[PDB]
Design a protein around this ligand. Structure first.
Ligand SMILES: *[C@@H]1O[C@H](CO)[C@@H](O[C@@H]2O[C@H](CO)[C@@H](O[C@@H]3O[C@H](CO[C@H]4O[C@H](CO)[C@@H](O)[C@H](O[C@H]5O[C@H](CO)[C@@H](O)[C@H](O)[C@@H]5O)[C@@H]4O)[C@@H](O)[C@H](O[C@H]4O[C@H](CO)[C@@H](O)[C@H](O)[C@@H]4O[C@H]4O[C@H](CO)[C@@H](O)[C@H](O)[C@@H]4O)[C@@H]3O)[C@H](O)[C@H]2NC(C)=O)[C@H](O)[C@H]1NC(C)=O
Ligand SMILES: *[C@@H]1O[C@H](CO[C@@H]2O[C@@H](C)[C@@H](O)[C@@H](O)[C@@H]2O)[C@@H](O[C@@H]2O[C@H](CO)[C@@H](O[C@@H]3O[C@H](CO)[C@@H](O)[C@H](O)[C@@H]3O)[C@H](O)[C@H]2NC(C)=O)[C@H](O)[C@H]1NC(C)=O
Ligand SMILES: *[C@@H]1O[C@H](CO)[C@@H](O[C@@H]2O[C@H](CO)[C@@H](O[C@@H]3O[C@H](CO)[C@@H](O)[C@H](O)[C@@H]3O)[C@H](O)[C@H]2NC(C)=O)[C@H](O)[C@H]1NC(C)=O
Ligand SMILES: *[C@@H]1O[C@H](CO)[C@@H](O[C@@H]2O[C@H](CO)[C@@H](O[C@@H]3O[C@H](CO)[C@@H](O)[C@H](O)[C@@H]3O)[C@H](O)[C@H]2NC(C)=O)[C@H](O)[C@H]1NC(C)=O
Ligand SMILES: *[C@@H]1O[C@H](CO)[C@@H](O[C@@H]2O[C@H](CO)[C@@H](O[C@@H]3O[C@H](CO)[C@@H](O)[C@H](O)[C@@H]3O)[C@H](O)[C@H]2NC(C)=O)[C@H](O)[C@H]1NC(C)=O
Ligand SMILES: *[C@@H]1O[C@H](CO)[C@@H](O[C@@H]2O[C@H](CO)[C@@H](O)[C@H](O)[C@H]2NC(C)=O)[C@H](O)[C@H]1NC(C)=O
Ligand SMILES: *[C@@H]1O[C@H](CO[C@@H]2O[C@@H](C)[C@@H](O)[C@@H](O)[C@@H]2O)[C@@H](O)[C@H](O)[C@H]1NC(C)=O
Lengths: 49, 363, 50, 44
């Protein structure tokens, strides 16, 4: 999921964590940064009886 | 009084800043003075600026092919051959200061704004009918409120150049001193920019020479990748050829002029910086980058590698020299320090970044 | 980060580069690699728990 | 394996599960129809 985000990273064109996974990228023509998130997130189901 | 004069340097109210360059020396502090209050027609040479009715500025050989200046109260910048022959308003408060400074083919004027002009000249000779300045001076502004009030200016020695947060005193071994802010010293990458972490990377952080150039002044200079760069070293100089040179500025308007950055290859080919979207005219056109709205750092290194804001936009053949043409600043917030140029050599350094900027380094 | 002798560490990248048959062989290299890295993490936590 | 409880049972291989916490994936969109996004640097 690509969501426009409200930070203002000045350096680079796209950003990755220390593990090399894409975190955000910058629209160069406008300077706006968009964060990239997984489509689904992990959960824990509580299974009793 | 200099309250109005320094308010022309548009600065935020609660900010304390450092002024550098050919400013008014002052009438009472130091040696300085030389305020020619009377029409004595003083005659001095080697002058690089005047402050304040007749003014005549000319080359020392008094070349008829060189343009001389004559201000009388009308202004004529003329050879026998006239470029400007007109009349200019000359009304000011008695405490207002108007000055002109010439250096490196550049002229700066203080007529209600910090006007900047490019003009190839040699203007040490001058006659007049109120003081001279030959060497750069330095001030501090303890500004506390907008306008004239709260500026609280004072003069100071050269040590104040270390007060500005964007310049540093280079250690004798070439290391950047600890505690530097690295405000716009982006780590260099051809790829994704690390957000938060630590990397041991080969980066040009072994600085040999740092030029703290006042914001209001541009720079026309020739740098070579085989000789030590010229200019006044801010700290301990290192007599080493630059593997990279790093330009740290404030606003993008410095570079927008055509031919601002001219890169000379070992083949002798010239790459001229052009914007309209920035290309490198080859004398064909090579696309550099869609220039970001805020250019803060341009680092150019031999091995044919140019970076804007710490990104690998373009790679070229092995360079040997660079010529600049930087064009001052926007005259809307200047001299809150200096815009700098650092000659650097590559080094393996441990770099910690949070956000996207360096925060501490270890060679 | 580690591409366990596969084409790349990005699994969608593998499926774009390779055909479905050979991609299955390539992605199985990193599935084995990540599973062994996941088992190593578990084995050392159970040691901490003991 | 349609019920989320049954989906959890089929996530493991067992008809009954002990009481506990079992990892789970958030129910993604049933219809994929995923739009294609492509971003690269401008070229000349
Ligand atoms: C974005 O992409 C661009 C382009 O791809 C990258 O640009 C690269 O930048 C690196 C530096 O960060 C360049 O590496 C440098 O290459 C120099 C080339 O030298 C040539 O002549 C020497 C003669 O000795 C040859 O050895 C070289 O060939 C290779 O040799 C060995 C063989 O494995 C390699 O290990 C070398 O790296 C060379 O690639 C070249 O033909 C090279 O001289 C230079 O080496 C200095 O630094 C290393 C440490 O990395 C020292 O060990 C070494 O001793 C050198 O330091 C000495 O330098 C001079 C040499 O005379 C001395 O006078 C000094 O006193 C000092 O002791 C270095 O390896 C690379 O070439 C360049 N790529 C291209 C294509 O141009 C960007 O990096 C990339 N962005 C980022 C962020 O990485
Ligand atoms: C730079 O400016 C700040 C802001 O204060 C402004 O400048 C001063 C020189 C005065 O003209 C102020 O009227 C003006 O608003 C200075 O901070 C202030 O400095 C003054 C004295 O220099 C302080 O007054 C004294 O401070 C001492 C220690 O703090 C007290 O013990 C005294 O009782 C007396 O209050 C004042 O507190 C201080 N802060 C404020 C909010 O005014 C600053 O000194 C000045 N110089 C530098 C180098 O920063
Ligand atoms: C990244 O940022 C750039 C810069 O804002 C975005 O480009 C913008 O795209 C929109 C939609 O194409 C342009 O809107 C214009 O609307 C008029 C109205 O009809 C139309 O005639 C134009 O042809 C255009 O569609 C907008 O002008 C344009 N901005 C520019 C050119 O500066 C871009 O969409 C962003 N996203 C990317 C590149 O993924
Ligand atoms: C370094 O930068 C300066 C400043 O841009 C360069 O001077 C500029 O040179 C151009 C080329 O001729 C001038 O354009 C001309 O302007 C006149 C108006 O005076 C116009 O009539 C011509 O048609 C042409 O457009 C430009 O004005 C001039 N800049 C200034 C402030 O006068 C200089 O050439 C550069 N040096 C190098 C070595 O690149
Ligand atoms: C050059 O550096 C200066 C600071 O070192 C910056 O430009 C100036 O930044 C100040 C601080 O924002 C601006 O002043 C104030 O801006 C706020 C914004 O909300 C406004 O509310 C205030 O009334 C006041 O204007 C100042 O305008 C600005 N100067 C400009 C835009 O010319 C900036 O880092 C660099 N300037 C540029 C143009 O990049
Ligand atoms: C490429 O640029 C170089 C500048 O480094 C040019 O060489 C100089 O051109 C000036 C022009 O006024 C001469 O005064 C110098 O004598 C030349 N040599 C040097 C060493 O500076 C060169 O002519 C340019 N070539 C092209 C094709 O543009
Ligand atoms: C390039 O430089 C070579 C080495 O000489 C020195 O190089 C650097 C380290 C500086 O100290 C410089 O002042 C010295 O000259 C020379 O052998 C070579 O001739 C030079 N070539 C050119 C074209 O200048």
């Amino acid at each position: 999921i690509i969501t426009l985000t409200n930070s203002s990273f000045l350096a680079g064109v796209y950003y990755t964590s220390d593990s090399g996974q894409l975190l955000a990228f910058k629209n160069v023509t406008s300077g706006a940064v968009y964060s990239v998130t997984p489509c689904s997130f992990s959960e824990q189901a509580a299974y009793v009886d | 009084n200099f309250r109005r004069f320094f308010s022309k340097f548009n600065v935020q109210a609660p900010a304390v800043v450092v002024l550098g360059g050919y400013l008014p020396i002052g009438e009472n502090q130091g040696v300085n003075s030389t305020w020619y209050c009377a029409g004595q027609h003083p005659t001095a040479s080697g002058v690089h600026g005047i402050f304040v009715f007749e003014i005549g500025i000319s080359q020392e050989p008094f070349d008829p092919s060189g343009y001389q200046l004559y201000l009388h109260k009308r202004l004529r910048i003329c050879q026998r051959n006239c470029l400007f022959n007109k009349a200019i308003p000359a009304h000011m408060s008695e405490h207002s200061v108007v000055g002109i400074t010439w250096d490196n083919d550049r002229v700066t004027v203080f007529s209600d704004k910090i006007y900047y002009f490019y003009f190839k000249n040699d203007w040490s000779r001058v006659a007049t009918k109120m003081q001279y300045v030959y060497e750069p001076t330095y001030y501090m502004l303890n500004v506390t409120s907008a306008g004239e009030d709260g500026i609280s200016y004072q003069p100071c020695t050269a040590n104040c150049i270390g007060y500005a947060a964007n310049v540093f005193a280079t250690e004798p071994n070439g290391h950047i001193p600890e505690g530097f802010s690295f405000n716009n010293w982006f780590l260099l990458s051809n790829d994704s920019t690390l957000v938060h972490g630590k990397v041991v990377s080969n980066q040009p952080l072994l600085v040999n020479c740092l030029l703290a150039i006042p914001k209001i002044y541009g720079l026309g200079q020739f740098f070579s990748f085989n000789q030590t760069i010229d200019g006044v070293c801010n700290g301990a100089a290192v007599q080493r050829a630059p593997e990279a040179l790093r330009f740290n500025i404030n606003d993008t308007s410095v570079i927008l002029a055509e031919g601002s950055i001219v890169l000379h290859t070992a083949l002798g080919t010239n790459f001229s910086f052009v914007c309209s979207y920035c290309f490198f005219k080859v004398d064909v056109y090579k696309f550099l980058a869609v220039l970001p709205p805020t250019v803060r750092e341009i680092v150019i290194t031999k091995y044919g590698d140019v970076y804007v804001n710490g990104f690998g936009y373009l790679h070229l053949g092995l360079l040997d020299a660079v010529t600049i043409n930087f064009t001052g600043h926007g005259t809307d917030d200047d001299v809150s320090g200096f815009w700098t140029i650092a000659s650097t050599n590559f080094v393996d350094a441990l770099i910690e970044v949070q956000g996207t900027a360096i925060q501490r380094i270890l060679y | 980060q580690h591409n366990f002798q596969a084409i790349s560490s990005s699994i969608d990248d593998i499926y774009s580069r390779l055909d479905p048959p050979s991609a299955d062989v390539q992605v199985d290299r990193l599935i084995t690699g990540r599973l062994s890295a996941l088992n190593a993490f578990v084995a050392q936590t159970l040691t901490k728990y003991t | 394996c349609d019920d989320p409880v049954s989906q959890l049972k089929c996530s493991q291989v067992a008809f009954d599960l002990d009481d506990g916490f079992y990892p789970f994936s958030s129910r993604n969109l049933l219809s994929h129809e995923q739009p294609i996004s492509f971003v690269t640097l401008p070229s000349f």
